[PDB]
CSV table of C-alpha atoms and ligand atoms in Angstrom, one decimal:
chain,number,residue,atom,x,y,z
R,1,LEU,CA,-77.6,20.3,-19.0
R,2,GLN,CA,-77.1,19.5,-22.7
R,3,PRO,CA,-74.3,17.1,-25.1
R,4,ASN,CA,-70.9,18.5,-25.6
R,5,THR,CA,-70.8,16.8,-29.0
R,6,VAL,CA,-74.4,18.8,-30.2
R,7,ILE,CA,-72.6,21.7,-28.5
R,8,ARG,CA,-69.4,21.7,-30.5
R,9,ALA,CA,-71.4,21.0,-33.5
R,10,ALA,CA,-73.2,24.3,-33.0
R,11,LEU,CA,-70.9,26.3,-32.3
R,12,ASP,CA,-69.0,24.9,-35.4
R,13,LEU,CA,-71.9,25.6,-37.6
R,14,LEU,CA,-72.4,29.0,-36.2
R,15,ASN,CA,-68.3,29.9,-37.4
R,16,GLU,CA,-70.1,29.0,-41.1
R,17,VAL,CA,-73.2,30.7,-41.0
R,18,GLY,CA,-73.3,33.0,-37.9
R,19,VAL,CA,-76.4,33.3,-36.0
R,20,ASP,CA,-79.0,34.5,-38.7
R,21,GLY,CA,-78.2,31.3,-40.2
R,22,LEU,CA,-78.3,28.8,-37.3
R,23,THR,CA,-81.3,26.9,-36.9
R,24,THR,CA,-81.7,23.8,-34.7
R,25,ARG,CA,-83.0,22.0,-38.0
R,26,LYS,CA,-79.7,22.7,-39.6
R,27,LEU,CA,-77.8,21.6,-36.5
R,28,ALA,CA,-79.6,18.2,-36.7
R,29,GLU,CA,-78.6,18.2,-40.5
R,30,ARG,CA,-75.2,18.6,-39.1
R,31,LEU,CA,-74.9,15.8,-36.8
R,32,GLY,CA,-76.9,13.0,-38.8
R,33,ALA,CA,-77.8,7.9,-30.9
R,34,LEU,CA,-78.1,10.6,-27.9
R,35,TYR,CA,-80.8,12.9,-27.6
R,36,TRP,CA,-81.3,16.5,-27.7
R,37,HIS,CA,-83.8,19.3,-27.9
R,38,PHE,CA,-83.8,22.8,-27.4
R,39,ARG,CA,-87.0,24.8,-26.3
R,40,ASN,CA,-86.2,27.4,-29.1
R,41,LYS,CA,-83.6,29.1,-31.0
R,42,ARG,CA,-82.8,31.5,-28.1
R,43,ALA,CA,-82.0,28.5,-25.7
R,44,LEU,CA,-79.5,27.7,-28.1
R,45,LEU,CA,-78.1,30.4,-28.4
R,46,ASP,CA,-78.3,31.0,-24.2
R,47,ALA,CA,-76.1,27.4,-24.2
R,48,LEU,CA,-73.9,28.9,-26.9
R,49,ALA,CA,-73.1,31.9,-25.1
R,50,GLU,CA,-72.4,30.0,-21.6
R,51,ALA,CA,-70.0,27.4,-23.7
R,52,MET,CA,-68.0,30.3,-25.5
R,53,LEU,CA,-67.0,31.0,-21.8
R,54,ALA,CA,-66.6,27.9,-20.4
R,55,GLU,CA,-64.1,27.3,-22.9
R,56,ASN,CA,-62.0,30.4,-23.2
R,57,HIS,CA,-62.7,33.1,-20.3
R,58,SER,CA,-60.1,32.3,-18.3
R,59,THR,CA,-59.0,35.0,-15.8
R,60,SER,CA,-63.1,34.9,-14.9
R,61,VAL,CA,-62.4,33.5,-11.3
R,62,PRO,CA,-60.1,35.8,-8.9
R,63,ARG,CA,-56.6,33.9,-7.5
R,64,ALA,CA,-54.5,35.1,-4.6
R,65,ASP,CA,-51.9,36.4,-7.0
R,66,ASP,CA,-54.6,38.9,-8.0
R,67,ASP,CA,-55.3,42.3,-7.5
R,68,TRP,CA,-58.0,44.6,-8.0
R,69,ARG,CA,-57.2,46.2,-11.3
R,70,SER,CA,-55.1,42.9,-12.6
R,71,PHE,CA,-58.4,41.0,-12.3
R,72,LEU,CA,-60.7,43.7,-14.1
R,73,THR,CA,-58.2,44.2,-16.6
R,74,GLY,CA,-57.4,40.3,-16.9
R,75,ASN,CA,-61.4,39.5,-16.4
R,76,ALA,CA,-62.1,42.1,-19.3
R,77,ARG,CA,-59.7,40.8,-21.8
R,78,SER,CA,-60.5,37.4,-21.0
R,79,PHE,CA,-64.7,38.0,-21.4
R,80,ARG,CA,-63.5,39.7,-24.7
R,81,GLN,CA,-61.2,37.0,-26.1
R,82,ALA,CA,-64.0,34.3,-25.1
R,83,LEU,CA,-66.6,36.6,-27.3
R,84,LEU,CA,-64.1,36.9,-30.0
R,85,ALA,CA,-63.5,33.2,-30.5
R,86,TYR,CA,-66.8,32.7,-32.5
R,87,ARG,CA,-68.4,34.4,-35.0
R,88,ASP,CA,-71.5,36.6,-33.5
R,89,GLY,CA,-69.7,36.1,-30.2
R,90,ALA,CA,-70.8,39.2,-28.8
R,91,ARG,CA,-74.4,39.7,-30.0
R,92,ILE,CA,-75.3,36.1,-28.9
R,93,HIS,CA,-74.1,37.1,-25.2
R,94,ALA,CA,-76.1,40.0,-25.3
R,95,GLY,CA,-79.4,40.2,-22.8
R,96,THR,CA,-78.2,36.9,-21.5
R,97,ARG,CA,-78.0,36.6,-17.4
R,98,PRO,CA,-75.1,34.4,-15.9
R,99,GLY,CA,-77.0,31.2,-14.8
R,100,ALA,CA,-77.0,29.1,-11.8
R,101,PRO,CA,-73.2,27.9,-12.2
R,102,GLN,CA,-72.0,31.3,-13.4
R,103,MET,CA,-74.2,33.0,-10.4
R,104,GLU,CA,-72.0,31.1,-7.4
R,105,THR,CA,-68.6,32.2,-9.5
R,106,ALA,CA,-70.1,35.5,-10.1
R,107,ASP,CA,-70.5,36.0,-6.5
R,108,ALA,CA,-67.1,35.5,-5.8
R,109,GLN,CA,-66.1,38.3,-8.3
R,110,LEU,CA,-67.9,40.6,-6.0
R,111,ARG,CA,-66.7,39.8,-2.6
R,112,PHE,CA,-63.1,39.9,-4.1
R,113,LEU,CA,-63.7,43.6,-4.9
R,114,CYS,CA,-65.8,44.8,-1.9
R,115,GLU,CA,-62.6,42.6,-0.2
R,116,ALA,CA,-60.3,45.1,-1.7
R,117,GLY,CA,-62.7,48.7,-1.2
R,118,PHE,CA,-65.5,49.2,-3.5
R,119,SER,CA,-68.9,49.8,-1.9
R,120,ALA,CA,-71.4,46.9,-3.0
R,121,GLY,CA,-73.2,49.4,-6.0
R,122,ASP,CA,-69.7,50.5,-7.0
R,123,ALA,CA,-68.6,46.7,-7.6
R,124,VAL,CA,-71.8,45.7,-9.7
R,125,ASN,CA,-71.3,49.4,-11.7
R,126,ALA,CA,-67.7,48.0,-12.2
R,127,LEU,CA,-68.5,44.6,-13.5
R,128,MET,CA,-71.7,45.9,-15.5
R,129,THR,CA,-69.7,48.7,-17.0
R,130,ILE,CA,-66.6,46.8,-18.3
R,131,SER,CA,-69.3,44.1,-19.4
R,132,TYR,CA,-71.2,47.0,-21.8
R,133,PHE,CA,-68.0,48.4,-22.6
R,134,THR,CA,-66.8,44.8,-24.0
R,135,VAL,CA,-69.5,43.4,-25.7
R,136,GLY,CA,-69.6,47.0,-27.5
R,137,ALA,CA,-66.2,46.9,-28.5
R,138,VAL,CA,-66.7,43.3,-29.6
R,139,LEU,CA,-69.6,43.9,-31.7
R,140,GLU,CA,-68.4,46.7,-33.5
R,141,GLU,CA,-65.2,44.8,-34.3
R,142,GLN,CA,-67.3,41.8,-35.3
R,143,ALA,CA,-69.9,43.3,-37.5
R,144,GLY,CA,-67.3,45.9,-39.1
R,145,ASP,CA,-65.6,42.8,-40.4
R,146,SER,CA,-69.2,40.7,-40.8
R,147,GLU,CA,-70.4,43.7,-42.9
R,148,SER,CA,-67.6,43.9,-45.2
R,149,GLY,CA,-69.2,42.3,-48.5
R,150,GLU,CA,-71.3,45.6,-49.1
R,151,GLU,CA,-56.7,52.9,-37.6
R,152,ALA,CA,-54.1,51.5,-35.1
R,153,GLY,CA,-55.8,48.2,-33.7
R,154,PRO,CA,-59.3,47.3,-32.3
R,155,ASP,CA,-57.1,45.8,-29.5
R,156,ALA,CA,-55.5,49.0,-28.6
R,157,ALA,CA,-59.1,50.7,-28.9
R,158,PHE,CA,-60.2,48.0,-26.3
R,159,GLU,CA,-57.3,48.1,-24.6
R,160,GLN,CA,-57.3,52.0,-24.0
R,161,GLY,CA,-61.0,52.1,-23.4
R,162,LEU,CA,-60.6,49.4,-20.7
R,163,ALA,CA,-57.5,51.7,-18.9
R,164,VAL,CA,-59.9,54.6,-19.1
R,165,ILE,CA,-62.7,52.8,-17.0
R,166,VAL,CA,-60.0,51.3,-14.8
R,167,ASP,CA,-59.0,54.7,-13.6
R,168,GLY,CA,-62.6,55.9,-13.1
R,169,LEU,CA,-63.1,53.2,-11.1
R,170,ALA,CA,-59.9,53.5,-9.1
R,171,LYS,CA,-61.7,57.3,-7.7
R,172,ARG,CA,-63.4,55.2,-5.2
R,173,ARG,CA,-61.4,51.9,-4.4
Z,1,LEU,CA,-78.9,60.2,-50.9
Z,2,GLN,CA,-82.3,58.2,-50.7
Z,3,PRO,CA,-86.2,59.5,-50.1
Z,4,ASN,CA,-87.9,60.1,-46.5
Z,5,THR,CA,-91.0,58.5,-47.4
Z,6,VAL,CA,-89.0,55.5,-48.0
Z,7,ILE,CA,-87.1,55.6,-44.8
Z,8,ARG,CA,-90.0,56.5,-42.6
Z,9,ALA,CA,-91.7,53.6,-43.7
Z,10,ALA,CA,-88.6,51.1,-43.4
Z,11,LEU,CA,-88.1,52.6,-39.5
Z,12,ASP,CA,-91.8,51.6,-39.1
Z,13,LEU,CA,-91.4,48.3,-40.3
Z,14,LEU,CA,-88.5,47.8,-38.2
Z,15,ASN,CA,-90.2,48.6,-35.3
Z,16,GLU,CA,-92.7,45.8,-36.3
Z,17,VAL,CA,-90.1,42.7,-37.2
Z,18,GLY,CA,-86.6,43.9,-36.2
Z,19,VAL,CA,-83.7,43.4,-38.1
Z,20,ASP,CA,-84.0,39.8,-38.8
Z,21,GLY,CA,-87.5,39.8,-40.4
Z,22,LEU,CA,-86.9,43.3,-42.5
Z,23,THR,CA,-85.9,42.9,-46.0
Z,24,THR,CA,-86.5,45.2,-49.1
Z,25,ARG,CA,-89.1,43.2,-50.7
Z,26,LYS,CA,-91.0,43.5,-47.2
Z,27,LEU,CA,-90.3,47.0,-47.3
Z,28,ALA,CA,-91.9,47.4,-51.1
Z,29,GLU,CA,-95.1,45.4,-50.1
Z,30,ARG,CA,-95.4,48.1,-47.2
Z,31,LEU,CA,-95.3,51.1,-49.7
Z,32,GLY,CA,-97.4,50.3,-52.7
Z,33,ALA,CA,-94.6,56.8,-57.9
Z,34,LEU,CA,-91.1,57.9,-56.7
Z,35,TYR,CA,-88.1,55.6,-57.3
Z,36,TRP,CA,-85.9,53.9,-54.8
Z,37,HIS,CA,-83.1,50.8,-54.8
Z,38,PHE,CA,-80.9,49.5,-52.1
Z,39,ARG,CA,-77.6,47.7,-53.0
Z,40,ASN,CA,-78.5,45.1,-50.6
Z,41,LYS,CA,-79.6,44.6,-47.2
Z,42,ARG,CA,-76.4,46.4,-45.4
Z,43,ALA,CA,-76.9,49.2,-47.3
Z,44,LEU,CA,-80.3,49.5,-46.2
Z,45,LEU,CA,-79.2,49.4,-42.4
Z,46,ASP,CA,-76.5,51.9,-43.2
Z,47,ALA,CA,-79.1,54.6,-44.3
Z,48,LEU,CA,-81.4,53.5,-41.1
Z,49,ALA,CA,-78.3,53.9,-39.0
Z,50,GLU,CA,-78.0,57.1,-40.1
Z,51,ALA,CA,-81.6,58.3,-39.8
Z,52,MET,CA,-81.7,57.3,-36.3
Z,53,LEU,CA,-79.5,59.8,-35.4
Z,54,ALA,CA,-80.2,62.3,-37.7
Z,55,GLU,CA,-83.9,62.5,-36.0
Z,56,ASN,CA,-82.9,62.1,-32.5
Z,57,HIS,CA,-79.0,62.6,-31.8
Z,58,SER,CA,-79.9,66.0,-30.3
Z,59,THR,CA,-76.4,67.1,-28.3
Z,60,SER,CA,-74.3,65.1,-31.4
Z,61,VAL,CA,-72.9,68.9,-32.2
Z,62,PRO,CA,-71.0,71.3,-29.5
Z,63,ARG,CA,-72.3,74.9,-28.5
Z,64,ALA,CA,-70.6,77.7,-26.7
Z,65,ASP,CA,-72.6,76.8,-23.5
Z,66,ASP,CA,-70.9,73.3,-23.4
Z,67,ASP,CA,-67.8,72.2,-21.4
Z,68,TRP,CA,-66.3,69.2,-22.4
Z,69,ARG,CA,-68.0,66.9,-19.4
Z,70,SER,CA,-71.3,68.3,-20.5
Z,71,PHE,CA,-70.9,67.4,-23.9
Z,72,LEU,CA,-69.4,64.3,-23.5
Z,73,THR,CA,-72.3,63.2,-21.2
Z,74,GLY,CA,-74.9,65.0,-23.0
Z,75,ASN,CA,-73.5,63.5,-26.0
Z,76,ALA,CA,-73.6,60.0,-24.7
Z,77,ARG,CA,-76.8,60.4,-23.5
Z,78,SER,CA,-78.0,61.6,-26.7
Z,79,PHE,CA,-76.3,58.8,-28.9
Z,80,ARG,CA,-78.1,56.3,-26.5
Z,81,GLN,CA,-81.7,58.0,-27.2
Z,82,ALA,CA,-81.1,57.7,-30.8
Z,83,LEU,CA,-80.4,53.9,-30.6
Z,84,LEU,CA,-83.1,53.1,-28.2
Z,85,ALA,CA,-85.9,54.8,-30.0
Z,86,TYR,CA,-86.2,52.0,-32.7
Z,87,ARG,CA,-86.1,48.3,-32.1
Z,88,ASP,CA,-82.5,47.1,-32.6
Z,89,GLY,CA,-81.2,50.5,-33.2
Z,90,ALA,CA,-77.8,49.3,-31.5
Z,91,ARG,CA,-77.1,46.4,-33.5
Z,92,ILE,CA,-78.1,48.1,-36.5
Z,93,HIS,CA,-75.2,50.4,-35.8
Z,94,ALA,CA,-72.7,48.3,-35.1
Z,95,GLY,CA,-69.9,48.2,-37.5
Z,96,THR,CA,-71.1,51.5,-39.5
Z,97,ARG,CA,-68.3,54.2,-40.1
Z,98,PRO,CA,-69.8,57.9,-39.6
Z,99,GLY,CA,-70.5,59.3,-43.2
Z,100,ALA,CA,-69.2,62.3,-45.4
Z,101,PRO,CA,-71.9,64.5,-43.6
Z,102,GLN,CA,-71.3,62.8,-40.4
Z,103,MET,CA,-67.6,63.3,-41.0
Z,104,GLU,CA,-67.6,67.1,-40.9
Z,105,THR,CA,-69.8,67.3,-37.8
Z,106,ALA,CA,-67.5,64.4,-36.1
Z,107,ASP,CA,-64.2,66.7,-36.6
Z,108,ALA,CA,-66.2,69.1,-34.7
Z,109,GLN,CA,-66.4,67.0,-31.9
Z,110,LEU,CA,-62.5,66.8,-31.5
Z,111,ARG,CA,-61.6,70.3,-32.5
Z,112,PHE,CA,-63.6,70.8,-29.2
Z,113,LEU,CA,-62.0,68.2,-27.0
Z,114,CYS,CA,-58.6,69.2,-28.0
Z,115,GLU,CA,-59.7,73.0,-27.5
Z,116,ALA,CA,-60.3,72.0,-24.0
Z,117,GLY,CA,-56.8,70.0,-23.4
Z,118,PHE,CA,-57.0,66.3,-24.4
Z,119,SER,CA,-54.3,65.0,-26.9
Z,120,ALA,CA,-55.3,63.6,-30.2
Z,121,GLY,CA,-55.5,59.7,-29.1
Z,122,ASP,CA,-57.0,60.5,-26.0
Z,123,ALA,CA,-59.7,62.5,-27.9
Z,124,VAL,CA,-60.2,59.6,-30.4
Z,125,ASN,CA,-60.1,57.2,-27.5
Z,126,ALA,CA,-63.0,59.5,-25.4
Z,127,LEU,CA,-65.3,59.0,-28.4
Z,128,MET,CA,-64.9,55.6,-29.3
Z,129,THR,CA,-64.9,54.4,-25.7
Z,130,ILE,CA,-68.1,56.2,-24.9
Z,131,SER,CA,-69.3,54.6,-28.0
Z,132,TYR,CA,-68.4,51.4,-27.4
Z,133,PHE,CA,-70.3,51.1,-23.8
Z,134,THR,CA,-73.3,53.1,-25.1
Z,135,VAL,CA,-73.8,50.6,-28.0
Z,136,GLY,CA,-72.8,47.7,-25.5
Z,137,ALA,CA,-75.3,49.2,-22.8
Z,138,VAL,CA,-78.2,49.5,-25.6
Z,139,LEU,CA,-77.5,46.1,-27.0
Z,140,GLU,CA,-77.9,44.4,-23.6
Z,141,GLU,CA,-81.0,46.3,-22.8
Z,142,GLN,CA,-82.9,45.8,-26.4
Z,143,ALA,CA,-81.9,41.9,-26.4
Z,144,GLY,CA,-82.9,41.5,-22.7
Z,145,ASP,CA,-86.4,43.0,-23.7
Z,146,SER,CA,-86.7,41.3,-27.3
Z,147,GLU,CA,-85.4,37.8,-25.8
Z,148,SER,CA,-88.5,37.8,-23.0
Z,149,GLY,CA,-90.8,35.2,-25.1
Z,150,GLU,CA,-88.1,32.6,-24.0
Z,151,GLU,CA,-82.4,45.9,-11.0
Z,152,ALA,CA,-82.5,49.6,-10.4
Z,153,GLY,CA,-82.7,50.8,-13.8
Z,154,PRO,CA,-80.8,50.1,-16.9
Z,155,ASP,CA,-80.9,54.1,-17.5
Z,156,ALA,CA,-79.1,54.1,-13.9
Z,157,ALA,CA,-76.5,51.5,-15.1
Z,158,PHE,CA,-75.9,53.5,-18.2
Z,159,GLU,CA,-75.7,56.8,-16.2
Z,160,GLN,CA,-73.4,55.3,-14.0
Z,161,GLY,CA,-70.5,53.4,-16.2
Z,162,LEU,CA,-70.8,56.7,-18.2
Z,163,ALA,CA,-70.1,58.5,-15.1
Z,164,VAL,CA,-66.9,56.5,-14.4
Z,165,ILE,CA,-65.9,57.0,-17.9
Z,166,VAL,CA,-66.0,60.8,-17.7
Z,167,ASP,CA,-64.2,60.6,-14.7
Z,168,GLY,CA,-61.0,58.4,-16.2
Z,169,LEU,CA,-60.9,60.6,-18.8
Z,170,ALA,CA,-60.6,63.4,-16.6
Z,171,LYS,CA,-57.1,62.1,-15.5
Z,172,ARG,CA,-55.7,63.6,-18.8
Z,173,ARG,CA,-57.7,66.7,-19.5
U,201,TDC,C1,-72.2,40.7,-13.0
U,201,TDC,C2,-72.8,40.3,-14.5
U,201,TDC,C3,-71.8,39.9,-15.3
U,201,TDC,C4,-72.6,39.7,-16.6
U,201,TDC,C5,-73.8,39.9,-17.0
U,201,TDC,O1,-74.2,39.7,-18.2
U,201,TDC,C6,-74.4,40.6,-16.0
U,201,TDC,C7,-76.0,40.6,-16.1
U,201,TDC,O2,-76.4,40.4,-17.4
U,201,TDC,C8,-76.9,40.9,-15.2
U,201,TDC,C9,-76.2,41.1,-13.9
U,201,TDC,C10,-75.2,41.0,-13.5
U,201,TDC,C11,-74.2,40.6,-14.9
U,201,TDC,C12,-71.4,39.5,-17.6
U,201,TDC,O3,-71.8,39.3,-18.9
U,201,TDC,C13,-70.1,39.0,-17.2
U,201,TDC,O4,-69.2,39.1,-18.2
U,201,TDC,C14,-70.0,37.6,-16.8
U,201,TDC,O5,-71.1,37.1,-16.5
U,201,TDC,C15,-68.8,37.2,-16.3
U,201,TDC,C16,-68.0,35.6,-16.0
U,201,TDC,N1,-69.1,34.8,-16.4
U,201,TDC,O6,-67.2,35.5,-15.5
U,201,TDC,C17,-68.0,38.2,-16.1
U,201,TDC,O7,-66.5,37.8,-15.4
U,201,TDC,C18,-68.2,39.5,-16.0
U,201,TDC,N2,-67.0,40.6,-16.5
U,201,TDC,C19,-67.3,40.8,-18.0
U,201,TDC,C20,-66.9,42.0,-15.7
U,201,TDC,C21,-69.7,39.8,-16.2
U,201,TDC,C22,-70.3,39.6,-15.0
U,202,TDC,C1,-65.6,59.1,-34.1
U,202,TDC,C2,-66.3,58.1,-34.1
U,202,TDC,C3,-67.7,58.0,-33.8
U,202,TDC,C4,-68.6,57.1,-34.1
U,202,TDC,C5,-68.2,55.7,-35.0
U,202,TDC,O1,-68.7,54.6,-34.9
U,202,TDC,C6,-67.0,55.9,-35.0
U,202,TDC,C7,-66.4,54.5,-36.1
U,202,TDC,O2,-66.9,53.4,-36.1
U,202,TDC,C8,-65.1,54.8,-36.4
U,202,TDC,C9,-64.0,55.9,-36.3
U,202,TDC,C10,-64.8,56.7,-35.4
U,202,TDC,C11,-66.1,56.8,-34.8
U,202,TDC,C12,-69.8,56.8,-33.5
U,202,TDC,O3,-70.6,56.0,-33.6
U,202,TDC,C13,-70.6,57.9,-32.7
U,202,TDC,O4,-71.3,57.6,-31.9
U,202,TDC,C14,-70.9,59.2,-33.8
U,202,TDC,O5,-70.9,58.7,-35.0
U,202,TDC,C15,-71.4,60.4,-33.6
U,202,TDC,C16,-72.3,61.3,-34.3
U,202,TDC,N1,-72.4,60.5,-35.5
U,202,TDC,O6,-72.6,62.5,-33.7
U,202,TDC,C17,-71.2,60.6,-32.1
U,202,TDC,O7,-71.6,62.1,-31.4
U,202,TDC,C18,-70.0,59.9,-31.2
U,202,TDC,N2,-70.1,59.8,-29.6
U,202,TDC,C19,-70.9,58.3,-29.3
U,202,TDC,C20,-69.3,59.6,-28.7
U,202,TDC,C21,-69.6,58.7,-32.1
U,202,TDC,C22,-68.5,59.5,-33.0
U,203,MG,MG1,-74.2,38.7,-19.6
U,204,MG,MG1,-70.7,54.0,-35.6
């Protein structure tokens, strides 16, 4: 794995300088006797990607009380907030692929949706599509804010698009 | 506005170095007697954002032969390809807001969907949501590729999520 004290420090610096200004040399200048090394920046951002979810993605895993709508909705809501908790959250996540630990739990997501009446390809599609929508929505929210140096709510807009998405999936539950 | 020879040169350099390596000083080192200036990088990326669409967003505007499904579908397909034509296309677009010229044509999109049976808030939601989904989908495609230094198709995956999206909107045409 890799130490928490180090990850916390990188997250906090990320809030200061965003992804573009975040480097491992600057990470060390923040910290200065337990050893750490990242294979490269991308590796740092993969770790932060994972950390963001560990800390905030709270209806990631299913629960007896869930039904399919309530899980995907909550799941999307919860993903989104993990992305929004940190500067450049969405950008960082892009192109990441869920890990070995994230795989076991990501297999639970499926075996629930199949349980509930979706086909295999439909279930992958429900997760990806929600995923693509969310990253998209957050990216636009985060950049619009981030770029302001040069109407009714990004939460509404998200919440709506997600409502539409859940309907079109219901057409094959 | 701002000169085409200059924009072409910036697009071509963008393909070489992505957004992170693109700066106005490097743009000039590419060119070196007609004058140009960008207020800042963000302004450069706003112009490139617009150029990408001017060049490739081909079922942006409606047409008598369109119906609503075929327009939103095509529209999304066409947007997406504009984003994919250039490195970091999606990232660049994030946070941009369609211009004065893009406004007149963006008003045509609506007055078509309202024409076809969507309410006002539904029509905004259809465009945004497709928009958020697309930027999301492309961002993940572009980064996954971009980051490779450290199953069945991103076109399928997009095409599917877009299919689901169009269904959930049909629930209020
Ligand atoms: C299934 C899947 C997912 C994600 C993902 O990136 C991904 C991928 O890049 C390739 C193949 C499959 C997936 C998510 O990012 C993620 O957000 C995620 O990792 C995830 C998670 N770790 O809990 C989720 O809950 C999912 N939710 C947004 C639908 C989604 C699931
Ligand atoms: C309506 C709207 C749109 C976009 C957009 O960014 C935006 C916004 O940032 C704030 C408020 C409204 C909009 C698009 O990016 C854009 O891609 C776009 O500019 C656009 C265009 N210029 O033709 C489109 O066709 C749209 N399509 C993806 C649904 C969508 C329309
Ligand atoms: Mg991911
Ligand atoms: Mg835009």
